[PDB]
């Protein structure tokens, strides 16, 4: 939609929505296995997982369904592997040891983190504050690396191998406009 | 000579800033058609002068170079004046469609400027035609989708809502809401978006 | 080059020095006595929107009626000033539509020594623009404001868009 | 499309088309069949949920009976209705973006439509309601501009489709705009049967594009985000080789 | 309900109403609207809850009926009213209005637009005294008149040379100028022109006026002459009234405002306009217009002398067989002014006035056709109850009050359509606007004519030209004709009605038309042992008939 210039870039709300439209693992608290009951029979999600379910077992559901069940007492969200101190330590060591490469990291970076820290507060084995501080440190390091890399802006192309969604979005308008200006200057000069 | 025309265009720029800084559709400024009709009068004088000059050129006593250069200058004058006027009107129509598209095509005369008399009569009939188009657009194959609804993605199912203005009781599907002044509701998000857009509810 | 663009229309109204390469009787009626013709090599300050076409029309030795003199905005002094230190230059005073007129001038006259210097100027200023945009308050010294008042008309749009993007990201981040 | 693997595939195609259209500087063609399936799906789902709700309402209001168990009853219908709301929001955003784009480029698309030599037709790009919107909006705006301003100028320049003199009035899209792309590679699971991809050191299958203006060649590997202009990338985007972010 | 109504349960009808009225169109359905739809369903019990198209299409008709009223965001007990409107949608359209209820519209010069004025009767209390105008109204009245005249002058085709304000004449001399303003006498006794900027003096010794006008104090005049700073004398060389404008070009500047709006009205919230139904009503008027004839009588019909009653009886005998649509009686109904009675021996003046109308109710008992089919219009004259009671038969306030109800308690019962209005009154036809105004004009413009130092058909020509060029019913100052401070807008010829009823006992009958307006000049009802009354055909044709 138009809304002034909101037709060119995504709003942060749209980013959160598109991220939360993703699968995740869950440990259910209840059971609705069919009596060998109302069918879930959704249209944009495999209902076999939701229908054929039993408590204290691992299964995969979309993130918003998991959040809805977490609002009730029917859910226990399983934390991902990269939300722990021992993985973040080797990650930060990787960025510090490599002053030119963006570290490998899922593009849902910072967003799943925000959502899980907002809602799934009590299910983490590690203390929340330490994880938040480590995430902040990673954010600072990647910000420094982005500023270091932006110093050159060719008119032909550019490469950014491991930037997350929000980092790309918050930088899109400035980079786009500057590159367009340079390109049109060169085109008018020839 | 078209310098006065610039005086219009510059003013239009300020209007865009009013559109820009607010980032909201409200209080479109009152028009400036007096300067426009002054420009129209002077360009009519220009056209009459051009026709006279062409008459003398066809008569034979006028030099060809003088006639052609005067014709070029006058044509540039008309082109620039038309450019200025169209630049004004394009932005006016754009902002008109902008606030017409989001208020369900009713122009919200019950609540935004009140009389809308700062718009020209031609602009007002254009607004009515665009409201007609908006009404017709959702009457086709998209009848089951509210195109003029909210554009913020749905994020939660239940929200707290605080009453802003007093009313009676309003029926909903399977239930009814009585709008007592200064009351707080714990209801579904997608059942009060129409009221929130109208401004009757607050504290989303 | 957009017909319905306010900024382009405004930039089209600046005056450029020019001289009557050819003598036309009966002209100058819009500036001086109408009965007095304009002689040869007469200097005038004409707007762009007619100087561009009158210098290319020819009319008829198919010499055009008017010849456009090098404007004082594009001079050796300004070239040296921008080549010395562009980041601290107050380019707002020289002109308010400097970039658009530079584009138009380089389009009319291809000069490979202008595109590179202007590109380096704006590239160097872009880093400072981003540095200031990313500086969100949590109210400032004189340096930020005195840089902000040196900006071009078009650079303000980039600065505002960047500031809004960073502000929105920060607002969504901390809730 | 010709057949559906699953409705989730249709959902993914819809979201990908929405993302492609949102950031594209040019009006892309119209996926009729996808929304043809989607509208029927929405209608049938709405009918089902309303039917079950009405049945439970009649059961609860015919007599006291037994109230429905909160377990496995409220949560399912909640899920269906919230999913339907989300899908409607996505479709609404897509349609409104298309409406804005056709608002901007009305004169250009009308100009290209009347050209017989051009192989592209307005029918493929625009839905019928969009055609009616374009024509009626153009006529109304033309009437407004003719009554307000064009009534007074001389015959030499009364037409607002003039492409002569100093400045033209038709706004072509900026095909050279810089966009953010993600090289999705081949949609096939083999991802190695395209006739275009080549290889470099350490394997790394890649596509080789060229820029005529700069007389350069750029290597585009799988899994790397690039910022590259739009004019030469139309084919890769159309073939679903790359996805815009 | 239907022939076999079934009592519904509101919960099971709630979804059907809510979906249609909250997702496609409409909003905020109240409980009373739900009950109205419930009874409407009771009137549509045929295969209901299983019939799709008819119920939804009737709801769409409900929307098409209730959208145009206000804004349609609530439905109160009136739901039954819109149901009855649905049933009823499954000569009229004409109005008569007086100066008391005319809509108020101010003017703003800096925005060049009329502004609606809230009515004191509708928002204020008005319990004790709501009709008394405020102090500044008389200050602003002449300002408004000058604003309208200046706007008319500026909109002229010829004038695009430019006029000059009075105050700008101080520093220049020996140069010609053009200016306009109010013409009057100063406190000293000389002739002066007034402008909002200031005032100057007038030199008349060598003035050649444009013939065909009644140059009278209180009238806007265009003045051309040479300033002289030796004294303060503006030596005028020519004088001419401002030209007039036609109705269509006047309306098109404001589109088509609902000033005399019968189909719609404006308010402080918004402005209204309409032109689609105008052609429909015009073509409706073009047919059966000869059947909708309306007839008026002469002025000053006295209800005390036998001869007038005899002639009126003859006229009613001729008019009973073919009852017209509107029958208008104009002029004073008593030959003597009414006032306080100093004698308790004879019949009181008030009682005599009351009896002067009772006999009319008896005379109307033998003309049941005219009473039944034709409406009655009564217009007060110069010396009726309210005016002559203070002015003693002389001229007085123009917005004259209607005939008191206590003195007309039998006309309203004998007849079914009787209307009393002010001295100026407005009737709104389907495509016509007509005003009726009873006073003396020829003598007033003859006695007070300005003197310039240097076949009866021309006098009415000059009168019509002056009254139309000036565009006001009372082109006189406050000394001669006192006017209520607020109601002066009712005396303005800004909408320039299509036809005007110029009732003048001092002018011969005439049927002139000019500047797109047609004027009729009814004479005295009885003259030189003859009775005369005139009827106007809405097709721009007139007939004059007399009965000895």
Curated annotation (Swiss-Prot), chain A:
KW Nucleus (keyword) present: yes
**CC terms in the record's Gene Ontology section:** CMG complex; DNA replication preinitiation complex; GINS complex; nuclear replication fork; nucleus
Q: Which organism is it from?
A: Saccharomyces cerevisiae (strain ATCC 204508 / S288c) (Baker's yeast)
For this UniProt record, give its keywords in alphabetical order, as a comma-separated list: DNA replication, Nucleus
InterPro entries attached here?
GINS_A, GINS_bundle-like_dom_sf, GINS_Psf2, PSF2_N
Q: Which Gene3D superfamilies match?
A: 1.20.58.1020, 3.40.5.50
Compartment list: Nucleus
Q: Biological process (GO) annotations? A: DNA-templated DNA replication; double-strand break repair via break-induced replication
Spell out the protein name for this chain. DNA replication complex GINS protein PSF2
Instruction: Cite the record's note on assembly.
Output: Component of the GINS complex which is a heterotetramer of SLD5, PSF1, PSF2 and PSF3. Interacts with PSF1 and SLD5.
Query: Which family would the database say this protein is a member of?
Result: Belongs to the GINS2/PSF2 family.
What is the annotated role of this protein in its UniProt record?
Functions as part of the GINS complex which plays an essential role in the initiation of DNA replication by binding to DNA replication origins and facilitating the assembly of the DNA replication machinery.
Q: Which Pfam families match?
A: PSF2_N (PF25005), Sld5 (PF05916)
Q: Does the keyword Cell cycle apply?
A: no
Swiss-Prot record, chain C:
The UniProt entry, under SUPFAM superfamilies, shows: GINS helical bundle-like, PriA/YqbF domain
A GO CC term assigned to this protein in UniProt: GINS complex
Q: What is the protein's quaternary organization?
A: Component of the GINS complex which is a heterotetramer of SLD5, PSF1, PSF2 and PSF3.
What is a biological process (GO) this protein takes part in? double-strand break repair via break-induced replication
Q: Which domain of life is it from?
A: Eukaryota
What the record says about family reads: Belongs to the GINS3/PSF3 family.
InterPro entries annotated for this entry? GINS_A (IPR021151), GINS_bundle-like_dom_sf (IPR036224), GINS_Psf3 (IPR010492), GINS_Psf3_sf (IPR038437), PSF3_N (IPR055221)
Q: Where in the cell is it found?
A: Nucleus
Descriptive protein name: DNA replication complex GINS protein PSF3
**Main location, first listed in the record:** nucleus
Q: What else is known?
A: Present with 2205 molecules/cell in log phase SD medium.
This molecule's function is given as:
Functions as part of the GINS complex which plays an essential role in the initiation of DNA replication by binding to DNA replication origins and facilitating the assembly of the DNA replication machinery.
Instruction: Output the Gene3D superfamilies linked to this UniProt entry.
Output: 1.20.58.2050
What does the UniProt keyword field contain?
Answer: DNA replication, Nucleus
Q: Which Pfam families match?
A: PSF3_N, Sld5
The answer, when asked if Ubl conjugation is one of the entry's keywords, is no
From Swiss-Prot, chain D:
Indicate yes or no for the key word Cell inner membrane. Answer: no
**Variant or mutagenesis effect after changing residue 17 to P:** Defective in DNA replication
Cysteine disulfide partners in this protein: none
Q: Where in the cell is it found?
A: Nucleus
Domain of life the protein comes from: Eukaryota
**Which family would the database say this protein is a member of?**
Belongs to the GINS4/SLD5 family.
What job does this protein perform? Required for DNA replication. Functions as part of the GINS complex which plays an essential role in the initiation of DNA replication by binding to DNA replication origins and facilitating the assembly of the DNA replication machinery.
What is the protein's name according to its record?
Answer: DNA replication complex GINS protein SLD5
Q: Which gene encodes it?
A: SLD5
UniProtKB/Swiss-Prot annotation, chain E:
Residues with PTM Phosphoserine = 474
Task: Check the record and name the Pfam families matching this protein.
Answer: DNA_pol_E_B
One of the protein's GO biological processes:
error-prone translesion synthesis
**One GO CC annotation:** nuclear replication fork
Q: Where in the cell is it found?
A: Cytoplasm; Nucleus
- Provide this UniProt record's keywords sorted from A to Z: Cell cycle, Cytoplasm, DNA replication, DNA-binding, Nucleus, Phosphoprotein
Say if the entry is tagged with keyword Cell cycle.
Answer: yes
> What role does this protein play?
As accessory component of the DNA polymerase epsilon complex participates in chromosomal DNA replication. It is required during synthesis of the leading and lagging DNA strands at the replication fork and binds at/or near replication origins and moves along DNA with the replication fork. It has 3'-5' proofreading exonuclease activity that correct errors arising during DNA replication. It is also involved in DNA synthesis during DNA repair.
What is the protein's given name?
Answer: DNA polymerase epsilon subunit B
Q: Which organism is it from?
A: Saccharomyces cerevisiae (strain ATCC 204508 / S288c)
Q: Which gene encodes it?
A: DPB2
């Amino acid at each position: 939609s138009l809304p002034a210039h909101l037709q060119q870039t995504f709003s942060p709300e749209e980013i959160q929505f598109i991220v939360e439209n993703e699968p995740i693992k869950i440990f259910p608290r209840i059971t609705t296995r069919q009596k060998i009951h109302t069918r879930w029979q959704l249209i944009t999600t495999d209902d076999k997982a939701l229908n054929n379910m039993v408590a204290m077992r691992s299964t995969e559901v979309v993130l918003w369904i998991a959040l809805l069940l977490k609002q009730q007492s029917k859910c226990s969200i399983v934390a991902p592997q990269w939300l722990t101190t021992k993985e973040l330590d080797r990650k930060i060591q990787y960025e510090k040891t490599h002053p030119d490469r963006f570290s490998e990291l899922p593009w849902n970076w910072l967003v799943l983190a925000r959502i899980l820290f907002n809602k799934a507060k009590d299910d983490f084995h590690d203390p929340i504050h330490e994880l938040r501080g480590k995430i902040q440190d990673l954010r600072e390091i990647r910000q420094i690396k982005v500023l270091k890399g932006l110093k050159y802006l060719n008119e032909s192309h550019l490469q950014l191998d491991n930037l997350s969604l929000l980092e790309i979005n918050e930088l899109r308008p400035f980079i786009t406009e500057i590159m367009d200006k340079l390109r049109e200057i060169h085109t008018a000069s020839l | 000579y078209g310098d006065l025309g610039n005086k219009l265009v510059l003013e239009a720029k300020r209007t865009k800033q009013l559109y820009a800084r607010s980032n909201q559709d409200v209080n479109l400024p009152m028009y400036h058609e007096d300067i426009i009709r002054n420009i129209l009068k002077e360009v009519s004088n220009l056209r009459k002068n051009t026709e006279y000059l062409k008459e003398q050129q066809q008569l034979g006593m006028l030099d060809d170079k003088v006639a052609k250069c005067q014709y070029f200058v006058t044509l540039l004058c008309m082109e620039r004046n038309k450019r200025c006027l169209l630049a004004y009107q394009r932005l006016r129509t754009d902002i008109l469609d902008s606030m017409a598209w989001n208020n369900n095509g009713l122009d919200l005369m019950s609540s935004s400027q009140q009389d809308t008399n700062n718009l020209s009569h031609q602009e007002q009939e254009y607004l009515k035609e665009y409201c007609d188009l908006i009404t017709d657009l959702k009457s086709g194959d998209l009848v089951d989708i509210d195109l003029s609804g909210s554009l913020v993605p749905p994020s939660d199912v239940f929200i707290d809502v605080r009453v802003l203005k007093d009313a009676g009781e309003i029926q909903t599907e399977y239930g009814v809401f009585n709008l007592i002044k200064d009351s707080q509701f714990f209801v579904r998000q997608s059942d009060v978006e129409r009221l929130i857009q109208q401004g009757y509810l607050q504290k989303i | 080059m957009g017909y319905y663009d306010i900024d382009d229309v405004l930039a089209d109204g600046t005056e450029f020095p020019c001289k009557f390469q050819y003598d036309i009787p009966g002209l100058g009626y819009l500036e001086n006595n109408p009965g007095r013709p304009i002689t040869k090599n007469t200097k005038l300050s004409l707007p762009l929107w007619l100087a561009r076409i009158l210098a290319i029309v020819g009319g008829d030795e198919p010499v055009p009626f008017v010849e456009l003199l090098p404007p004082d905005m594009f001079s050796t002094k300004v070239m040296n000033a921008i080549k010395t230190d562009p980041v601290a230059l107050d380019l707002h005073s020289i002109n308010s539509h400097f970039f658009s007129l530079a584009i138009k001038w380089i389009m009319l006259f291809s000069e490979k020594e202008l595109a590179n210097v202007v590109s380096e100027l704006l590239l160097q200023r872009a880093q400072e623009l981003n540095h200031h945009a990313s500086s969100l308050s949590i109210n400032t010294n004189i340096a930020t404001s005195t840089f902000l008042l040196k900006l071009e008309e078009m650079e303000k749009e980039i600065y505002k868009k960047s500031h809004e993007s960073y502000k929105d990201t920060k607002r969504w981040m901390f809730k | 499309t010709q057949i559906y693997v699953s409705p989730q595939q249709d959902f993914s195609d819809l979201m990908k088309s929405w993302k492609n259209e949102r950031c594209s500087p040019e009006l892309l063609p119209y996926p009729h069949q996808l929304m043809k399936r989607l509208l029927n799906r929405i209608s049938m789902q709405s009918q089902l949920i309303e039917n079950i709700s009405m049945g439970f309402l009649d059961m609860q209001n015919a007599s006291n009976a037994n109230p429905p168990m909160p377990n496995e009853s409220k949560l399912p219908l909640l899920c269906m209705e919230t999913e339907l709301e989300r899908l409607k929001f996505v479709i609404r955003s897509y349609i409104r973006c298309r409406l804005s784009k056709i608002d901007k480029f009305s004169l250009y698309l009308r100009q290209l439509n009347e050209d017989e030599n051009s192989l592209i037709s307005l029918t493929d790009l625009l839905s019928k309601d969009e055609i009616k919107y374009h024509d009626t909006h153009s006529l109304i705006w033309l009437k407004l501009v003719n009554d307000s301003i064009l009534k007074y100028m001389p015959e030499e320049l009364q037409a607002i489709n003039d492409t002569e003199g100093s400045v033209n009035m038709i706004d072509e899209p900026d095909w050279n705009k810089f966009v953010f792309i993600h090289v999705n590679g081949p949609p096939d699971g083999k991802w190695n049967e395209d006739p275009l991809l080549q290889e470099n050191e350490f394997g790394k299958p890649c596509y080789t594009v060229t820029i005529p203006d700069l007389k350069e060649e750029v290597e585009l590997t799988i899994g790397s985000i690039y910022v590259m202009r739009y004019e030469v990338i139309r084919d890769l985007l159309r073939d679903d080789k790359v996805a815009l972010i | 309900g239907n022939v076999l109504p079934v009592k519904i349960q509101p919960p099971l009808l709630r979804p059907l109403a809510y979906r249609v009225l909250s997702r496609k169109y409409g909003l905020s359905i109240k409980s009373d609207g739900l009950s109205a739809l419930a009874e409407f369903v009771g009137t549509n019990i045929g295969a209901n809850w299983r019939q799709g198209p008819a119920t939804i299409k009737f709801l769409e008709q409900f929307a098409a009926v209730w959208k145009q009223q206000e804004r349609g965001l609530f439905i109160d007990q009136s739901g039954v009213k819109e149901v009855i409107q649905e049933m009823k949608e499954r000569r009229d359209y004409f109005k008569v209005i007086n100066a008391s209820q005319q809509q108020r519209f101010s003017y703003n010069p800096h925005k060049m637009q009329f502004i609606f004025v809230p009515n004191k009767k509708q928002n204020g209390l008005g319990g004790i005294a709501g009709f008394l105008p405020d102090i500044e109204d008389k200050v602003q009245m002449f300002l408004t008149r000058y604003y309208l005249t200046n706007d008319r002058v500026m909109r002229n085709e010829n004038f695009q040379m430019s006029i000059t304000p009075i105050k700008n004449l101080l520093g220049r001399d020996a140069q010609n100028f053009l200016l306009l303003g109010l013409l009057n006498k100063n406190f000293k006794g000389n002739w002066s022109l007034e402008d909002p900027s200031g005032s100057v003096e007038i030199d008349i010794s060598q003035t050649i006026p444009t013939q065909g006008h009644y140059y009278v104090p209180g009238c806007m005049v265009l003045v051309e002459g040479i300033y002289y700073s030796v004294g303060n004398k503006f030596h005028v060389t020519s004088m001419t009234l401002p030209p007039g404008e036609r109705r269509e070009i006047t309306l098109e500047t404001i589109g088509n405002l609902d000033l005399l709006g019968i189909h719609g009205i404006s308010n402080n919230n918004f402005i209204a306009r309409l032109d689609k139904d105008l052609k429909i009503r015009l073509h409706l008027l073009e047919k059966e217009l000869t059947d909708h004839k309306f007839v008026i009588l002469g002025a000053n019909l006295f209800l005390d002398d036998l001869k007038i009653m005899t002639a009126l009886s003859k006229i009613l005998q001729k008019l009973n067989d073919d009852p017209p649509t509107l029958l208008i009686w104009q002029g004073s109904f008593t030959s003597v002014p009414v006032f306080a009675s100093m004698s308790s021996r004879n019949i009181s003046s008030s009682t005599q006035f009351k009896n002067n109308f009772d006999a009319l109710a008896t005379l109307l008992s033998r003309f049941d056709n005219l009473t039944e089919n034709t409406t009655m219009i009564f217009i007060p004259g110069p010396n009726d109850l309210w005016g002559s009671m203070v002015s003693l038969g002389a001229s007085g306030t123009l917005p004259q009050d209607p005939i008191p109800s206590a003195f007309t308690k039998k006309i309203n019962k004998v007849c079914k359509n009787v209307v009393w209005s002010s001295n100026p009154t407005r009737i709104a036809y389907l495509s016509q606007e007509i005003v009726i105004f009873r006073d003396d004009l020829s003598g007033r413009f003859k006695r007070h004519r300005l003197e310039f130092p240097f076949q009866k058909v021309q006098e009415t020509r000059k009168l019509v030209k002056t009254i139309l060029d000036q565009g006001h019913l009372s082109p006189f100052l406050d000394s001669l004709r006192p006017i209520s401070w607020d109601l002066d807008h009712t005396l303005t010829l800004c909408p320039i009605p299509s036809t005007m009823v110029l009732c003048d006992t001092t002018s011969a009958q005439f049927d002139l038309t000019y500047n797109g307006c047609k004027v009729i000049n009814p004479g005295s009802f009885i003259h030189n042992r003859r009775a005369r009354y005139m009827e106007y055909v809405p097709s721009s044709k007139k007939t004059i008939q007399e009965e000895i």
